[PDB]
Design a protein around this ligand. Structure first.
Ligand SMILES: CCCCCCCCCCCCCCCCCC(=O)OC[C@H](COP(=O)([O-])OCC(O)COP(=O)([O-])OC[C@@H](COC(=O)CCCCCCCCCCCCCCCCC)OC(=O)CCCCCCCCCCCCCCCCC)OC(=O)CCCCCCCCCCCCCCCCC
Ligand SMILES: CCCCCCCCCCCCCCCCCC(=O)OC[C@H](COP(=O)([O-])OCC(O)COP(=O)([O-])OC[C@@H](COC(=O)CCCCCCCCCCCCCCCCC)OC(=O)CCCCCCCCCCCCCCCCC)OC(=O)CCCCCCCCCCCCCCCCC
Ligand SMILES: CCCCCCCCCCCCCCCCCC(=O)OC[C@H](COP(=O)([O-])OCC(O)COP(=O)([O-])OC[C@@H](COC(=O)CCCCCCCCCCCCCCCCC)OC(=O)CCCCCCCCCCCCCCCCC)OC(=O)CCCCCCCCCCCCCCCCC
Ligand SMILES: CCCCCCCCCCCCCCCCCC(=O)OC[C@H](COP(=O)([O-])OCC(O)COP(=O)([O-])OC[C@@H](COC(=O)CCCCCCCCCCCCCCCCC)OC(=O)CCCCCCCCCCCCCCCCC)OC(=O)CCCCCCCCCCCCCCCCC
Ligand SMILES: CCCCCCCCCCCCCCCCCC(=O)OC[C@H](COP(=O)([O-])OCC[N+](C)(C)C)OC(=O)CCCCCCCCCCCCCCCCC
Ligand SMILES: CCCCCCCCCCCCCCCCCC(=O)OC[C@H](COP(=O)([O-])OCC[N+](C)(C)C)OC(=O)CCCCCCCCCCCCCCCCC
Ligand SMILES: CCCCCCCCCCCCCCCCCC(=O)OC[C@H](COP(=O)([O-])OCC[N+](C)(C)C)OC(=O)CCCCCCCCCCCCCCCCC
Ligand SMILES: CCCCCCCCCCCCCCCC(=O)OC[C@H](COP(=O)(O)O)OC(=O)CCCCCCCCCCCCCCC
Lengths: 62, 231, 177, 109, 67, 178, 136, 168, 51, 102, 125
């Protein structure tokens, strides 16, 4: 029947499992607050290389 | 055909062009020497005043009620099956009363009209008091519509369809951002148009445009890469 | 040819240099390129593609070089621990060595972190440091087999140049004070 | 198609017809005079008689098409030459057999 | 080879990568650019003639075209 | 459309969406022709329900021709229908229609499963007998098989030669002054 | 590049690095993006002139690279924002040495444009450092 | 060509699963595989269309001279991440992977898990390192961590060795 | 005027067939609904073109 | 490779072989159809090779006219009041006066 | 195209300008024209020829060695293979043992030769 998933097992554990992704995201953001205030690594797509791939062969032809 | 034309208007562009502006007050100013009847009749400008929150709420409620009545006329009533005894009793009422069809229509459309009015009023208040001054307009529309339609589908239709209500709300929010808050098929400006300010001579403007063209040349891949044959 | 994507925002753009006013939704491809998309996405946009590739390689080598400093000082600490008994070990470590260990901490050297968070000024300084070391090495031509490739004629010319430079340096008198 | 000069010129009155022989004879005469004048911009007033004959003989749409074609021809003549175009096309066709590899580590822009 | 001998780029890239761009730009870009620059060519010619003469025109100075 | 001292520059080819529409119509007609030729080669009375897709479980040519035709109609990348769908999405992106792209993708994925689900029914316990008998033997038509083979070749390798077809369609549409 | 020699150095050659101001970096990047057409034109025209009159017996051998003069002047004007003169010959004394180095790189040594753009950018940087508020 | 090579891998793998798998459930597993992977393929196709239509280039290196606005960049990264995560299994898009691994040939499961899920990683790396992205990656990191946690927690409840290896 | 009508028709048709196309059980119905789906897709493309 | 005639001949040969395989008849059946298919394929693909280039050339020529339509279509698409604006006034006068040379 | 020698006179330009825009040495002009400032096209052609020859040798040797090893050691079970090799003649045993090893080893040596740049003229001291 509809909604049996919530009741089956334990409601508290089911809700915790359901909210786990939200907890992970919130923990990541709280951790990133520390990175922002300190100056360490932050959750971003760093672009140090101007599109230059790792150990790529860059050559030209005559 | 445009949706929400007034909101998405370029005041500066219409002003420089001289085009009439939809933001004009649109108000009546009866004279002190005018008749009492004229003074009373000039009060109707409050029905045009767009800053009147009560007026806007009633406007949204009327829109919702009309939509609900249209849905009832088209699909709702025809899909719903009435008991045979109820149908016989109401037909007997029509026979025994003049204009019984009007009262039957009132009875049948009361639920749809009332729910539509409630939805319209609540939606207007929701969108106006909340989400009106958010930064990401697309995200605001998507989230607001998702939540509102989730609740609406849970209540009006069935609590078991709230996920579908939320998905439909996301789709409706994207559609509204596309064609209601934005002008994709309602353009009132030429692409690339601009206005000139300052006392710049035509020679200076032409020189700047020549520089802009030289910069624009770099957009072409062949010229940038130097991969052109000698003509 | 590069193009653009239609904009939906109803903001106004005032270009003081060209003395015109545009609207965000009305911009064409070239106007979008000029006004939007003109931000920088690298430490040194002023450099060409080849120059910035060299800059990127020098920055990577400089990060590795700072990590090498940290590894070398750690190895020296291990050497000190083995050679010197625990008595007087901390007394002798409370010197240049301890200060260098602290000065080569994580903010200054990216040990194992995914990214060394450096502003463009810091990246330029690291590249300049790497280039200073390269200049010092190339003065005497120590980079032929390692950190460089050259032909036989180039090697011979470099040997003659280094010989002349060493002779001149030796003939120079000692620095006063 | 409201903006299409060609499609608008293809329109006509129910009984309208074009005498192509006469129109083209008149246009040839007028354009020969214009070419003899050999000016950057076509000044029809320098050829009054032929201009009047051309206007009478040819229809407005035909005249519009002819003037646009003449402008394009003038631009092409100012720009290119027969031998130059031949050499350029030959070089481009020869190049088409090869590949266009990217130029890595450029110097411009 | 033969099927691609019309263009140096491969056929799949020609079909998909180029969307909306004129075939004059895809093939024979030099003629496309020269047609685009038609009037700028004469402006540059006039600027060069005046520069040889005493006059120096600053309005058309940026127009130094090589393609 | 750009203006530089009253000189207009146009890097957009207006007669391109019509060419893409013609390309999509032609690709669908070709794939429809392929599947219908496969059907016509066989006995028509056998196919009357989606369950009867198992009746296509015949010798390798018919079986795999049906499979690849269904995949092409679905829009699987290597096949012909993918070219039309991909070019439609490319033109939508060029015209900056993100909502249209969203709805196209929803329809495309739903239709993709609609076509794919029949591959489940194609599985059959044994080999079907769907060929008409003539002179006491099954009648296999060499001409229709050859046409199906040409259609199969083009369905497999349309991407390679699509540039020529795109050139021809753009050439046809360029005459329209819109 | 971006290295200053040590005035009081114990050994013959010593260099200390410096970082250009953000304003200088922004100016150089913007001007390069705007004027990159001229640099590619200089390369293509250099190759074209060498092909046309490279041979000694050619009639135009005595006019070598003069057609490149217009491209070089246009590039200089574009990089300097039409100020500080309308020609490369009008370069200020602060950048005259770098201008001479660039000309030697391009026309005498025929070195790659990758190399010679360094000297041209050095000319622009010298002018920008000299003036500061005049260019922005 | 990069995108076309990425998309070509579907047909041979589907045919192998469809015609070589002994189990009868492989017929439905193949359809699940096709649909789930094709949804992500369509997402990556939309991203490629955004890149190509906006930037007419195809050399994979001309993107250095073109900068995508914030909205375009966020759309591209979201589409790219979701599309390539459909192939490289991420939570919640691993139902197809479990079904296919359970019901596929034992010899083809090796190839699938070992290689066919890493072409997506390679493509994601190429595209995201070529494009400049100015968005917080916390959401993507959370998705990956949730997938790791979900698979690890479910490992215990599998008595089927093949499904357990699929969760690994 | 055509753009809004086409958009409404396309949206209604898509949301009406999303469920119906999975309710058929006939070969002829499959062929007809293939035609219908392709027609809707081409209508969306036509909207994009007329934009 | 480079010869469209040879490419078409190979295509016809492989088409005949595939047709035999699909029909489940020996590949040596109806041998006279091999040269027939090769000749037909060579001729048709040679003609198509010529036709594609002719179509491309005519399309390039048509794009010149289409540019004229685009410029004039853009001016006529201007919203009311923009045809005399500073951004389009000069171009509008150029197309309404200078090009009124009938 | 306005970029041409037509109309240019040395009188118009200053002596310093002419010296600046003067053609370099004839040898320098030839090197620049032929793109042989650092390496010659003939050097490139020789390198390509050696590369192709090395690849063909390596691939052929690998194929020969692999196939020989497979066919010699894929005759049956251990007992069957041992008996066949015992009945095998002396020269046949020698070839069976040596062919695969020699082919594979020659391929690997040719591969190692390229990375090892021993033929450098600076060997001295
Ligand atoms: C938001 C602010 C936060 C800060 C403030 C401080 C924290 C406040 C948190 C709230 C605490 C009070 C409310 C909890 C009530 C219980 C849960 C509930 O309602 O579900 C229905 C409840 C549970 O139903 P069920 O789980 O289906 O029953 C299973 C059977 O009992 C059969 O069981 P079994 O024999 O099979 O054994 C299984 C058992 C044991 O299971 C196991 O052994 C496996 C492990 C299970 C999880 C144990 C907790 C681990 C730590 C969780 C940390 C969460 C972090 C993420 C969230 C952060 C949010 C800030 O499973 C259970 O634990 C079930 C008992 C209920 C869950 C208890 C654990 C989770 C409670 C919430 C904790 C939140 C902490 C937040 C702060 C964290 C630090 C920053 O049903 C009942 O009422 C039946 C009785 C159950 C026992 C009740 C014991 C007394 C609880 C207090 C009663 C008075 C409450 C007054 C509230 C006043 C208004 C606020
Ligand atoms: C012009 C074309 C139409 C001409 C007339 C018909 C002849 C042509 C027929 C062919 C055309 C298709 C017909 C399809 C029929 C479908 C089935 C059906 O209903 O008939 C079966 C029905 C039963 O057939 P039976 O079984 O043989 O007869 C049994 C009984 O003996 C029958 O006796 P009974 O008394 O039971 O039936 C009376 C029947 C006929 O109706 C009447 O009795 C006469 C009604 C006259 C209109 C009254 C409303 C006020 C009009 C004001 C006009 C001036 C406005 C100025 C505004 C100025 C602003 C500055 O009642 C109805 O139809 C019910 C609705 C009537 C009220 C319509 C209200 C429209 C406006 C609503 C606005 C929203 C209000 C929101 C709430 C506001 C609260 C403050 O047949 C008939 O009774 C005869 C045909 C009547 C057809 C009426 C069709 C509806 C149109 C009514 C007028 C609409 C005016 C709109 C403009 C003004 C708006 C304010
Ligand atoms: C007797 C024929 C002898 C042919 C010898 C080879 C000569 C070329 C073929 C000429 C055939 C002409 C007549 C049509 C016969 C086929 C249709 C038919 O009805 O047959 C019935 C006939 C008898 O009926 P049946 O056998 O009972 O029916 C079974 C079914 O047909 C089912 O059989 P199936 O499952 O084996 O069918 C093949 C299957 C799966 O087939 C495949 O997957 C083909 C794989 C080919 C190997 C190389 C793939 C490399 C891909 C790298 C990535 C490229 C990315 C490029 C970017 C865009 C995306 C491609 O389906 C597909 O092909 C769909 C996927 C297509 C993927 C697109 C790949 C494009 C590659 C383009 C060539 C690249 C060359 C690079 C090197 C040169 C550079 C200058 O069938 C056969 O006898 C067997 C036909 C099997 C396919 C033959 C071709 C495979 C080998 C191709 C080698 C040359 C490369 C391809 C280009 C060719 C020129 C355009
Ligand atoms: C990238 C996507 C590409 C999508 C492509 C979609 C279409 C692909 C599949 C269909 C392609 C056409 C296949 C040929 C026609 C079908 C019949 C046939 O020839 O086989 C029977 C016949 C079999 O002979 P048999 O088995 O000894 O005896 C059969 C009976 O016992 C006794 O036979 P019978 O006596 O009853 O009949 C004899 C007659 C039977 O054949 C026929 O009657 C022909 C039936 C088809 C008529 C329509 C053809 C249209 C061609 C133009 C392009 C559009 C194609 C559209 C196709 C689908 C339309 C729904 O045989 C012939 O004469 C064959 C001539 C075929 C060439 C006709 C060319 C007409 C061109 C007209 C337009 C020219 C340009 C105008 C420009 C104007 C500008 C102002 O074929 C052969 O003898 C050779 C077979 C092996 C080689 C086939 C080579 C096919 C080459 C196709 C090239 C397609 C265009 C280039 C590629 C475009 C994309 C890059
Ligand atoms: C067993 C040990 C368990 C340890 C605890 C595990 C984690 C518990 C949950 C932590 C919640 C942290 C919430 C604050 C972080 C918000 C991050 C953020 O910016 O998100 C905005 C997000 C959006 O973020 P965004 O990504 O759009 O931000 C824009 C991007 N940046 C920031 C980069 C510019 O908005 C939300 O939707 C937040 C909804 C919050 C709902 C209410 C949560 C209340 C939680 C209370 C927890 C209990 C009190 C603390 C207990 C511990 C005390 C020591
Ligand atoms: C085709 C694309 C599909 C897109 C899918 C869109 C996803 C739709 C998800 C709907 C979720 C349900 C409605 C949420 C309404 C509230 C939103 C909000 O507050 O954000 C507005 C504010 C307004 O933001 P803003 O507009 O001022 O700033 C935007 C910032 N940038 C530009 C960086 C994006 O936004 C946020 O702070 C959150 C943004 C991310 C969305 C987070 C949703 C969290 C939902 C769970 C809330 C839990 C509350 C506590 C209870 C926890 C459980 C016990
Ligand atoms: C000046 C001009 C002079 C021209 C002189 C005339 C030249 C004629 C050349 C004829 C060559 C015939 C070769 C036959 C080879 C058969 C091999 C074989 O046994 O295969 C059987 C195999 C097997 O067939 P099967 O189906 O019977 O299988 C038997 C095996 N079991 C039992 C297991 C089933 O099938 C084939 O390959 C035969 C069919 C294909 C034959 C292809 C012939 C191509 C001919 C091309 C000619 C090109 C000429 C170009 C001229 C250009 C001039 C400008
Ligand atoms: C197994 C041996 C491998 C040898 C290493 C090189 C292999 C190169 C690829 C060969 C592929 C098979 C032949 C293809 C023929 C074809 O149609 O080839 C057709 C094409 C012709 O191309 P063009 O038409 O463009 O000229 O062939 C080539 O381009 C070159 C073919 C290879 C040339 C080297 C031959 C080496 C012979 C070695 C003999 C000893 C081998 C012993 C093995 C036990």
């Amino acid at each position: 029947y509809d909604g049996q998933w919530w009741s089956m097992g334990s409601l508290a554990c089911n809700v915790l499992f359901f909210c786990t992704p939200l907890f992970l995201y919130l923990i990541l953001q709280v951790e990133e607050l520390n990175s922002e205030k300190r100056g360490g690594t932050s959750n971003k797509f760093y672009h140090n290389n101007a599109g230059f791939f790792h150990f790529q062969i860059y050559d030209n032809k005559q | 055909m445009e949706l929400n034309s007034s909101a998405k208007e370029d005041s500066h562009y219409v002003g420089v062009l001289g085009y009439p502006s939809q933001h004009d007050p649109h108000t009546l100013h009866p004279k002190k020497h005018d008749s009492t009847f004229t003074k009373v009749y000039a009060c109707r400008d409050m029905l045009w005043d767009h800053h009147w929150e009560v007026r806007n709420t009633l406007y949204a409620g009327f829109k919702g009620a009309l939509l609900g009545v249209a849905y009832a006329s088209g699909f709702g009533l025809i899909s719903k099956t009435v008991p045979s005894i109820v149908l016989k009793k109401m037909f007997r009422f029509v026979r025994n009363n003049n204009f019984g069809h009007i009262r039957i229509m009132q009875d049948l459309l009361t639920p749809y009209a009332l729910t539509g009015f409630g939805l319209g009023s609540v939606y207007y208040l929701y969108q106006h008091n909340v989400w009106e001054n958010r930064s990401n307009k697309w995200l605001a529309e998507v989230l607001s519509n998702a939540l509102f339609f989730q609740v609406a589908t849970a209540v009006c239709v069935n609590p078991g369809f709230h996920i579908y209500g939320m998905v439909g709300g996301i789709l409706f929010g994207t559609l509204k951002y596309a064609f209601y808050n934005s002008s994709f098929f309602q353009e009132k400006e030429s692409i690339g148009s601009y206005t000139t300010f300052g006392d710049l001579s035509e020679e200076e403007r032409k020189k700047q445009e020549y520089k802009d063209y030289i910069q624009f040349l770099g957009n072409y891949h062949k010229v940038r890469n130097g991969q052109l044959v000698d003509l | 040819a590069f193009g653009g994507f239609r904009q939906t925002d109803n903001s106004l753009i005032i270009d003081d240099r060209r003395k015109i006013i545009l609207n965000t939704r009305s911009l064409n491809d070239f106007q979008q390129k000029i006004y939007l998309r003109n931000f920088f996405t690298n430490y040194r946009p002023d450099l060409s593609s080849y120059d910035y590739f060299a800059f990127k390689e020098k920055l990577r080598i400089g990060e590795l070089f700072l990590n090498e400093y940290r590894k070398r000082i750690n190895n020296e600490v291990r050497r000190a621990a083995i050679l010197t008994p625990t008595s007087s070990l901390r007394e002798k470590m409370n010197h240049k060595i301890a200060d260098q260990i602290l000065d080569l901490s994580s903010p200054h050297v990216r040990g194992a972190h995914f990214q060394a968070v450096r502003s463009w000024t810091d990246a330029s300084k690291i590249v300049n440091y790497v280039e200073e070391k390269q200049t010092k090495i190339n003065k005497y031509g120590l980079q032929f087999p390692l950190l460089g490739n050259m032909t036989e004629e180039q090697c011979a010319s470099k040997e003659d140049e280094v010989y002349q430079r060493l002779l001149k340096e030796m003939q120079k008198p000692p620095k006063k004070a | 198609m409201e903006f299409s000069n060609a499609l608008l010129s293809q329109t006509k009155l129910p009984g309208q017809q074009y005498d192509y022989k006469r129109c083209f004879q008149a246009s040839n005469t007028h354009f020969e005079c214009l070419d003899s004048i050999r000016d950057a911009y076509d000044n029809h007033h320098k050829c009054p008689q032929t201009y009047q004959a051309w206007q009478s003989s040819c229809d407005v749409g035909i005249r519009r098409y002819q003037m646009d074609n003449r402008e394009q021809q003038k631009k092409d003549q100012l720009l290119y030459s027969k031998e130059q175009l031949k050499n350029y096309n030959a070089a481009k066709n020869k190049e088409a057999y090869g590949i266009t590899a990217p130029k890595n580590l450029s110097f411009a822009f | 080879g033969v099927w691609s001998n019309i263009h140096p780029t491969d056929k799949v890239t020609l079909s998909f990568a180029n969307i909306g761009r004129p075939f004059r730009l895809i093939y024979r870009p030099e003629i496309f650019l020269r047609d685009q620059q038609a009037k700028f060519i004469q402006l540059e010619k006039e600027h060069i003639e005046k520069s040889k003469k005493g006059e120096f025109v600053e309005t058309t100075s940026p127009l130094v075209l090589w393609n | 459309m750009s203006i530089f001292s009253n000189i207009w520059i146009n890097n957009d080819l207006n007669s391109y969406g019509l060419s893409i529409l013609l390309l999509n119509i032609i690709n669908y007609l070709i794939v429809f022709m392929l599947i219908l030729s496969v059907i016509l080669l066989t006995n028509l009375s056998k196919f009357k329900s989606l369950n009867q897709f198992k009746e296509f479980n015949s010798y390798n040519f018919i079986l795999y021709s049906l499979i690849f035709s269904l995949l092409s109609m679905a829009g699987i990348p290597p096949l012909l229908g993918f070219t039309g769908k991909f070019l439609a999405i490319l033109y939508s992106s060029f015209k900056s229609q993100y909502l249209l792209i969203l709805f196209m993708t929803i329809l495309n994925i739903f239709g993709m499963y609609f076509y794919i689900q029949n591959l489940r029914f194609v599985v059959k316990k044994n080999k079907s007998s769907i060929l008409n008998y003539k002179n006491y033997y099954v009648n296999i038509n060499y001409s229709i098989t050859l046409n199906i083979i040409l259609l199969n070749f083009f369905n497999f390798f349309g991407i390679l030669f699509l540039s020529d077809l795109i050139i021809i369609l753009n050439y046809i549409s360029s005459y329209i002054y819109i | 590049m971006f290295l200053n020699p040590v005035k009081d150095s114990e050994f013959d050659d010593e260099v200390k690095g410096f970082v250009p101001s953000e304003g200088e970096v922004r100016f150089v990047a913007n001007k390069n993006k705007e004027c990159g057409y001229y640099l590619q034109g200089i390369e293509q025209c250099r190759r074209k002139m060498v092909q046309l009159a490279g041979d000694s017996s050619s009639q135009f051998h005595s006019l070598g690279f003069l057609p490149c003069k217009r491209l070089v002047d246009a590039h200089y004007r574009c990089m300097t924002d039409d100020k500080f003169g309308s020609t490369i010959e009008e370069v200020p004394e602060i950048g005259l040495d770098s201008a001479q180095k660039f000309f030697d790189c391009t026309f005498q040594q025929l070195k790659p444009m990758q190399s010679c753009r360094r000297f041209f950018d050095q000319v622009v940087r010298d002018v920008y450092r000299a003036n500061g508020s005049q260019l922005i | 060509l990069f995108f076309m090579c990425y998309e070509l891998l579907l047909i041979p793998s589907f045919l192998i699963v469809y015609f070589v798998s002994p189990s009868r459930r492989a017929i439905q597993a193949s359809l699940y595989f096709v649909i789930w992977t094709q949804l992500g393929s369509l997402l990556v196709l939309i991203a490629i269309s955004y890149i190509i239509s906006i930037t007419n280039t195809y050399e994979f290196n001309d993107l250095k001279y073109f900068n995508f606005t914030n909205s375009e960049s966020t759309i591209i990264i979201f589409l790219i991440f979701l599309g390539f995560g459909f192939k490289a299994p991420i939570w919640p898009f691993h139902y197809w992977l479990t079904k296919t691994h359970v019901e596929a040939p034992s010899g083809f499961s090796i190839y699938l898990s070992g290689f066919l899920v890493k072409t997506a990683l390679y493509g994601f790396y190429k595209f995201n390192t070529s494009i400049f992205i100015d968005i917080d990656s916390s959401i993507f990191i959370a998705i990956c961590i949730m997938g790791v946690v979900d698979s690890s927690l479910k490992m215990w409840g599998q008595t089927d060795l093949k499904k357990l290896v699929a969760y690994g | 005027f055509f753009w809004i009508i086409l958009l409404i028709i396309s949206i209604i048709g898509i949301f009406y067939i999303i469920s119906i196309i999975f309710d058929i059980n006939l070969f002829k119905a499959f062929l007809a609904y293939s035609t219908i789906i392709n027609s809707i897709s081409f209508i969306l493309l036509i909207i994009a073109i007329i934009f | 490779m480079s010869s469209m005639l040879i490419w078409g001949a190979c295509f016809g040969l492989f088409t005949r072989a595939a047709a035999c395989k699909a029909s489940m008849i020996p590949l040596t059946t109806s041998p006279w159809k091999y040269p027939k298919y090769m000749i037909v394929s060579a001729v048709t693909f040679y003609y198509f090779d010529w036709y594609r280039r002719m179509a491309l050339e005519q399309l390039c020529y048509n794009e010149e006219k289409l540019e004229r339509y685009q410029i004039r279509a853009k001016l006529q698409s201007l919203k009311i009041g923009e045809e005399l604006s500073d951004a389009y006034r000069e171009s509008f006068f150029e197309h309404a006066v200078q090009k009124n040379n009938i | 195209m306005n970029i041409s020698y037509t109309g240019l006179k040395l009188e118009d330009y200053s002596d310093e300008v002419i010296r600046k825009y003067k053609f370099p040495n004839s040898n320098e002009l030839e090197r620049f024209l032929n793109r042989e400032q650092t390496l010659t096209v003939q050097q490139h052609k020789s390198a390509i020829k050696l590369a192709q020859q090395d690849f063909f040798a390596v691939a052929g040797l690998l194929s020969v060695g692999s196939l020989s090893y497979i066919f010699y050691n894929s005759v049956g079970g251990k007992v069957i293979r041992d008996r066949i090799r015992a009945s095998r003649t002396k020269a046949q045993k020698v070839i069976v043992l040596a062919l695969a090893f020699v082919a594979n080893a020659a391929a690997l040596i040719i591969a190692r030769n390229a990375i090892t740049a021993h033929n450098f003229g600076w060997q001295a001291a």
